[PDB]
Ligand code: HEM
Ligand code: HEM
Ligand SMILES: Cc1cc(N)nc2cc(-c3ccc(OCc4cocn4)c(CN)c3)ccc12
Ligand SMILES: Cc1cc(N)nc2cc(-c3ccc(OCc4cocn4)c(CN)c3)ccc12
Ligand SMILES: C[C@H](O)[C@H](O)[C@H]1CNc2nc(N)[nH]c(=O)c2N1
């Protein structure tokens with residue numbers, strides 16, 4: 001049974017057979033769509049069918065389905081599960097798994113790059129200091145003096161859920177936020193809650209506007225420990241504007257490496273609860289969301305003031321106008337410092353080409369239109385007119401509750 | 412099952428019980444979300460019709476606080492007998508108006524639904540001819556325009572009987588500009604209307620072959636061949652488009668019409684099918700500026716606007732498209748507001764819609780909403796609907812898509 005999607009700007013129609021391989025649920029039903037809902041402990045019982053399914057996929061991809069290496073591996077995993085109640089992925093399987101978790105990430109516009117992922121095996125790690133050293137190396141390799149390279153570091157998988165590895169930071173590099181007694185916020189409001197945990201764990205907060213947060217790392221279920229990334233490893237870009245000389249005086253900067261560290265990697269029923277992964281920014285992530293969201297740095301007002309816009313009535317579109325300039329400045333600053341960045345016209349065009357190629361050679365490409373469409377200038381990007389099917393494929397990256405809500409404290 | 416939606420910019424959480432009344436289907440399943448598909452989806456048998464009417468009359472008599480009353484049961488009985496005999500039934504004028512207002516109230520893709528109860532309903536069910544149709548539509552246009560002080564209106568023509576006697580307005584909107592292809596390359600006028608502009612000429616229209624030629628009306632009564640009619644130019648209020656800073660803007664020779672009057676949908680009340688039901692409101696600025704002027708398959712004038720702004724059109728990363736998009740939308744609002752023609756900007760409409768959502772959750776328990784369509788086609792994340800989770804589901808009475816008549820009509 002086939003399903004069709006139509007690009008209404010080019011009348012290109014593609015056919016999706018891949019959605020039949022979907023297993024997990026979406027949250028939607030025949031009578032309700034939850035497409036805009038942000039967010040819609042495992043035993044031997046349900047694990048071998050998950051392993052068998054992953055291994056079938058793995059050996060199909062290497063054109064060895066039904067081979068002796070395939071049947072032998074199935075057997076070996078089988079006995080290892082009934083005997084040890086889990087199993088270990090080979091290096092080849094881990095790398096395939098991590099690449100396909102990205103390939104399957106329906107909300108990721110950057111997936112044209114999925115096959116060029118540098119996979120760092122940190123499964124021998126045992127301590128938070130060992131985590132800090134693995135993460136320092138990831139940051140150095142991925143940053144590459146501005147010539148950014150996609151990377152993932154994979155720490156030991158969950159066993160009984162009482163010995164999890166977790167990175168408590170939502171991203172490896174993020175700026176601190178401090179709520180002031182007068183109700184205002186110093187720094188990134190998005191990080192106030194995490195900043196307070198850090199201070200409570202003994203972090204000495206400089207209390208500046210762009211302080212890089214410490215790493216808060218949890219190994220084998222132990223209490224998390226604080227470490228400071230060497231500042232020389234944190235590449236930062238001062239934001240200036242190519243026409244507006246006063247823009248630099250706003251004193252803004254941003255870090256070069258987007259490295260998301262709070263998601264869970266699922267491969268063949270195995271759960272990798274600490275698996276930081278990094279790429280490079282789309283400009284709007286910083287310029288639209290990080291600076292102009294009302295609940296973020298919210299520099300929209302000051303930029304509009306310095307531009308001398310009609311800020312009286314919103315129908316003057318001063319907000320829209322300031323937003324475009326801030327994003328021009330983000331792109332200009334990164335390009336001038338030769339730090340890898342992509343604008344949202346380039347990134348959406350590439351994704352369409354990626355999506356079409358995936359329909360040709362894979363039978364589909366799961367895609368979350370709500371998330372793929374950029375947060376500004378939506379309809380003048382080619383994804384806006386593109387119909388998309390959203391379904392859940394594994395290997396996958398999943399959400400997980402923040403660890404401070406679930407952690408049993410040692411003391 | 413008593414679902415919840417969170418606003419992520421305000422943490423406000425609403426609880427949706429209204430969705431449990433949902434009758435029709437969304438097109439999603441547990442395995443696949445189709446929330447970005449443009450269009451999912453002959454007589455009604457004597458059996459299917461009575462439950463549809465009971466459901467509708469039940470909610471009608473609830474709304475007037477007479478559920479389970481004398482008047483209710485009698486009406487239920489009376490309609491039951493009429494269907495039994497005539498194989499259809501007629502709505503009381505009160506039921507007609509309620510049904511029409513609630514079809515708007517239920518239009519999950521409509522951002523302007525805070526105005527839903529202030530709909531002027533014109534009962535044209537006594538109409539028998541295309542000339543009579545034309546008379547009703549001129550009266551609609553003049554009433555709705557109101558010398559620029561636009562007023563919401565729907566005009567409802569006779570309901571479908573056996574699908575052989577359908578009343579249809581062939582235009583997609585009452586007022587739309589013509590589109591003629593060129594012997595050399597692209598298109599003059601409006602490319603969305605190229606096929607229809609042909610079926611007008613190919614039906615007898617004498618095209619002035621300008622860029623802003625108001626299309627003729629093509630009206631089909633009782634299933635007969637449709638007829639061409641010209642709307643009196645003095646009823647078509649138009650706004651010349653200029654910019655409050657750029658005097659070269661007028662040189663572009665741009666104007667748009669004040670009245671958005673959609674005429675190709677089907678209104679369904681209590682099982683009855685009104686195939687001709689043109690309804691009108693007033694524009695949100697982006698529906699002209701972002702879509703009608705800057706979509707690649709539309710007026711696509713982005714090229715010359717950025718050129719006349721002397722912007723760096725060599726790399727996409729200068730965001731010249733974005734800058735031009737903002738300016739074109741500032742001009743549309745400016746021109747409409749200057750000429751005292753009603754228009755709403757995307758910031759005001761979306762703010763209004765959050766307020767409407769809150770009202771609907773309070774006094775009705777929910778509000779079906781389609782985030783893919785409620786979020787404006789520009790500056791999405793700086794409008795409040797972006798961070799608002801929404802639940803999409805289909806309630807009746809409703810407006811529905813219907814096939815284009817020329818694909819159906821035996822000529
Ligand atoms: C290389 C350049 C990349 C770019 C430009 C990019 C861009 C994006 C953007 C713009 C989003 C939307 C999130 C938001 O706007 O808040 C996203 C989501 C996502 N990205 Fe990519 N990304 C890149 C690489 C990667 C890599 C290397 C991985 C993993 C190995 C990854 C995994 C994901 C996932 C899992 C999501 C969605 C998470 C969710 O479901 O909530 N991305 N990406
Ligand atoms: C009065 C001011 C109104 C405003 C500002 C407004 C705004 C909008 C916008 C922006 C859309 C998205 C469509 C697009 O982007 O092309 C839409 C859709 C829609 N509007 Fe409203 N609208 C208004 C009045 C009305 C009225 C009076 C009705 C019916 C009586 C109505 C029914 C609809 C329907 C049925 C749809 C979408 C149809 C579908 O499901 O695809 N609107 N509106
Ligand atoms: C490798 C990479 C590169 C990039 N250029 N971008 C990325 C963006 C995300 C990502 C995914 C989900 C997100 O949303 C989480 C959420 C917040 O609230 C409810 N869910 C966010 C928001 N930081 C970012 C993940 C990875 C990214
Ligand atoms: C009264 C009113 C006012 C307004 N201010 N705006 C409106 C916009 C629409 C509307 C409905 C559906 C649409 O899409 C249907 C479709 C046609 O082809 C493929 N899908 C479109 C886009 N033309 C507009 C309908 C009514 C509107
Ligand atoms: C492919 C996509 O579903 C299609 O372009 C939709 C997306 N959202 C939209 N949203 C609005 N308001 N109007 C539209 O025409 C569309 N088009």
Ligand SMILES: C[C@H](O)[C@H](O)[C@H]1CNc2nc(N)[nH]c(=O)c2N1
Pocket residue numbers: 035036037038370371372373375419797798799800801
């Ligand atoms: C409610 C809504 O789904 C939520 O705000 C989503 C919408 N789409 C998004 N799209 C991107 N790229 N990033 C986001 O954080 C979000 N947030």
Ligand SMILES: [Zn+2]
Pocket residue numbers: 028032033034035439443444445446
């Ligand atoms: Zn859905």
